[PDB]
């Protein structure tokens, strides 16, 4: 009943996507209608523009705050942490669910003013759903599932979530795999793929309701490099900004006082810049989130068009011709693009900071695309005829590449490129874009940590494995430091009354079996229930017939923490005994490991 489980989650996710998306569409449409209709006067119009983005965000913030600390503001990093082995029980709990979806919806509605995507939150939701499903299974049939299985399920859920938001089965899962953990099995991948497929099928069902040259390649590479550089710049800012936010007593105090209020303020600020007559002509502000991307990836070469004919500024953004928003007479299209970039960067970090359920991939992708588009435009201007069979330069492709590359750099993921391709439809120029992406990754992974990684660092979540730009003394600690030094030895030489007493007292899941009280040397392990049963009906007991489970593995006190962690992850274990010169000294489990990790993180 694994396949069935996989199926069930996926369909649900798809349904959620459909509903939420629909809601977003409707509300946004309504807002648009209101904006046009309210009137010519600036005050009223301003209010309309500002209130809607503010209010929704505030509501979302409110929803986030009241439930539990890890309820809102976390998507991928927490998931990653969980995968790494250190589990946060508050994260997977479903009491969260009801608060978060609504918040996400609100965020989406708020749209291109707030400028936030839906991925991470969606992924989190999916994971939660998966967990819930698992729990039921555990309850309804058999016993409580092994940790490994649960982890796998979570991973699958995450993959499905990532696919769903995209509307892309092949790439999304891959992306999830890349980001979400360090190593990954093939079965997991397969499961993810299956989930994605299911989601796609559901979506389909729910439709009734509703040849580049070497110079070009070189250019693409350059573009990719540029994107990577930009990505790197962004990441540092993002991390530093987050740190600052965490620190500042004034800021921190304010946050403590009113989570909603700060968010509201941020929204207001965003609106003030993002107002259409004030600075929206320059930023191409008045576009939906999807619309922006479409505009960026439009087949027409803008500069040339502009030169040919001065384009009109329509009353509402033209469904066929979205690029008209990017033009201004005083600021050439290039200028507008530049404004969008820098201004977006300034805003984007701020947006990321605000405490709410929100994804930060889509915005990054858009940013990447914008730069690419700009580059393409520049190239076009340089070579109006084009590069010499004299083919014209298509900036759409460039834009796409930029989107792929910058985003990849940010996230440390080549499967961004794949996703881009999928979105496009055409794999005809698979290479140059891919190359660019790779270049970006190289530049960015060598200078900065991933966006997700950065966020994790800022949080100070218990993630043992190495991250760039994060000094920590993890190699120094050994098992002797963090082992559970208190244990309950049961030796073959001991009396029966004593054993009984011990049983009455502790009821530990697995007692060690020892040779003798003096030596304290392990010869196996005993389960507790079985022992109890035996008592109801130690050498003598053994003779009579209680089953001994042999100790399959033994850690030393002088072993490193890292190694232990790896063992726990990879072999998929629950608990393990420690032995110094053969003696039962410690009992290592996840509880202790987790504690150690926490200590390492937070001195």
């Amino acid at each position, epitope marked *: 009943e694994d396949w069935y489980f996989l199926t069930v989650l996926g369909v649900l996710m798809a349904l959620i996507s459909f509903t939420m998306s629909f809601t977003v569409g409707r509300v946004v449409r309504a807002h648009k209608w209101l904006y046009r209709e309210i009137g010519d006067s600036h005050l009223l119009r301003y209010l309309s523009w500002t209130v809607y983005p503010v209010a929704l965000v505030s509501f979302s913030s409110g929803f986030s705050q009241s439930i539990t600390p890890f309820s809102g503001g976390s998507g991928i990093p927490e998931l990653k942490t969980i995968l790494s082995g250190v589990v946060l029980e508050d994260y997977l709990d479903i009491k969260n669910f009801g608060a978060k979806a609504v918040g996400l919806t609100c965020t989406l509605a708020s749209g291109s003013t707030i400028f936030l995507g839906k991925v991470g939150p969606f992924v989190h939701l999916s994971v939660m759903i998966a967990a819930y499903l698992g729990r039921v299974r555990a309850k309804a049939t058999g016993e409580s599932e092994n940790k490994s299985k649960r982890n796998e399920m979570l991973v699958a859920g995450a993959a499905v979530g990532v696919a769903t938001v995209f509307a892309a089965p092949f790439s999304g899962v891959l992306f999830c795999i890349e980001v979400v953990s360090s190593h990954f099995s093939v079965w997991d991948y397969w499961r993810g793929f299956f989930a994605a497929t299911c989601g796609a099928f559901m979506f389909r069902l729910l439709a009734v309701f509703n040849p580049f040259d070497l110079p070009e390649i070189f250019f693409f590479v350059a573009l990719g490099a540029i994107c990577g550089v930009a990505s790197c710049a962004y990441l540092f800012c993002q991390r530093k900004f987050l740190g600052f936010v965490k620190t500042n007593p004034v800021l921190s105090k304010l946050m403590a006082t009113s989570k909603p209020l700060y968010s509201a303020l941020a929204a207001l600020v965003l609106a003030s810049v993002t107002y259409p007559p004030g600075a929206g002509r320059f930023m191409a502000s008045r576009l939906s989130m999807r619309e922006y991307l479409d505009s960026l990836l439009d087949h*027409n070469s803008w500069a040339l*068009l502009t*030169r*040919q*004919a*001065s384009p*009109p500024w329509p009353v509402e953004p033209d469904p066929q011709n979205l690029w008209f928003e990017w033009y201004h007479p005083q600021f050439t299209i290039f200028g507008t693009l530049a404004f969008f970039l820098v201004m977006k960067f300034w805003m984007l970090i701020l947006a990321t900071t605000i405490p709410m359920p929100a994804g930060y991939f889509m915005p990054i992708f858009i940013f990447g695309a914008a730069i690419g588009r700009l580059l393409g435009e520049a190239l076009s201007v340089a070579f*109006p005829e084009g590069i010499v069979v004299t083919n*014209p330069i298509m900036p759409g492709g460039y834009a796409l590449a930029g989107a792929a590359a910058f985003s990849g750099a940010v996230t440390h993921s080549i499967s961004t490129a794949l996703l881009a391709f999928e979105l496009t439809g055409q794999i005809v120029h698979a290479l140059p874009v891919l190359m660019a992406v790779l270049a970006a990754n190289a530049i960015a992974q060598s200078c900065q940590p991933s966006f997700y990684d950065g966020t994790i660092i800022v949080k100070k979540l218990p993630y043992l494995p190495w991250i760039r730009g994060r000094k920590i003394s993890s190699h120094r600690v050994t098992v002797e430091h963090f082992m559970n030094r208190a244990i309950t030895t049961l030796a073959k030489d001991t009396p029966q009354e004593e054993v009984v007493k011990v049983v009455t007292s502790t009821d530990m899941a697995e007692y060690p079996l020892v040779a003798s009280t003096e030596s304290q040397t392990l010869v196996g392990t005993m389960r507790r229930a079985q022992l109890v049963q035996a008592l109801q009906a130690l050498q003598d007991i053994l003779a009579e017939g209680c089953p001994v489970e042999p100790v399959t593995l033994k850690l030393s006190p002088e072993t490193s923490l890292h190694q232990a962690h790896n063992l726990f992850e990879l072999l998929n274990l629950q608990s393990l005994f420690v032995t110094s010169q053969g003696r039962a000294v410690g009992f290592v489990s996840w509880v202790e490991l987790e504690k150690a990790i926490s200590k390492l993180t937070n001195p």
Partner: antibody
Amino acid sequence: DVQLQESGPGLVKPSQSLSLTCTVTGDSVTSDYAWSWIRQFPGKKLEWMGYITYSGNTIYNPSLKSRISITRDTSKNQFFLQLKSVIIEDTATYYCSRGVDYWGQGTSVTV
Amino acid sequence: DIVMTQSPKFMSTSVGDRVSVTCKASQNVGTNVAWYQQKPGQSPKTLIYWASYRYSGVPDRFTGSGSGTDFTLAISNVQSEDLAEYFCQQYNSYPLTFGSGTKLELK
């Protein structure tokens, strides 16, 4: 209100290079637009010649790359053609235009 | 070069009727098509710079539609002053190609 006024010789002999001077009033030639040249034959079929950018990068029709040469003087705000190797088939009414927005009145060229 | 074919080459309608001149492009143009009006003798004044966008000072009756490969100039309520040739041109690619246009007479 951008206004373009052509001027030059009407009658020309074949195998002798012709030149048309288009003066501009309203906008500067140094602005970022497509300052194109176009001609219409006696049978009323239009052919696009080419244009100069703000910087000076000339772009021509592939079919007429050999013979066409287009230049400007930024002081006077004007456009100069220098169409060489003139043939009786080239006989047409010429049109000096700023992109697509505004077209000049034009002059009738005769070979 | 990208050829602009168009039809119908000649038309004859009364005052008040509708006329629809259609242009067809070989390759994909997008929406980057401009329509003109040339009265015999005078310069060809632009009417519609992008399909579904009239130039300032032009009557509302001159409507333009289409995208991709096929485009249509529709004129409703024809007056006596609309005796003219009407060309479509594209400017997505280079070189810029004009259709031969259509001479229009009235009864």
